[PDB]
Structure 1
C-alpha cells in the first residue's frame, strides 16, 4: 500500500500531466506551422502576423 499502490494510483500522474500538456504544445505548433505557411508572397502584414503566431 505504501509503494506499489501509490505508484499505480498517483505515481504516473505528473508524467501524464507533462505528456498531455507537451503533445498539446505540438498540436498547436503543427497547426501554426500550417498557419505560417498560408502567407501570400505579395504580403507583409500577413507575414509578420502569421510569423508572430509561429
Structure 2
C-alpha cells in the first residue's frame, strides 16, 4: 500500500498531465499553423496578425 498503491495512484500523474498538455500543445500548434497560412497573398496586415497567432 505504501509504495506500489501510491506509485499507481499518484506517482504517474504529473507525467501524464504534462504529456497530455504537450500533445494538446502540438494540436493547438497544428491548427495555428493553418491559421497563420490562410491569409491571401496580396494581404499584409492580416498576414502580420496571422503570423502573430503562430
For the criterion TM > 0.5, the same-fold answer is yes
Segments of structure 2 that go 5 or more residues without pairing to the other structure are: none
CA RMSD of aligned residues (A): 0.7
How far off its partner does 1:37 sit?
1.2
Q: What is the aligned partner in structure 1 of residue 29 from structure 2?
A: 29
Segments of structure 1 that go 5 or more residues without pairing to the other structure are: none
Q: Deviations over 1:1-54 (max 9, x none)?
A: 111110011111000110111111111100010111101110001110100000
Q: Structure 1-normalised TM-score?
A: 0.93
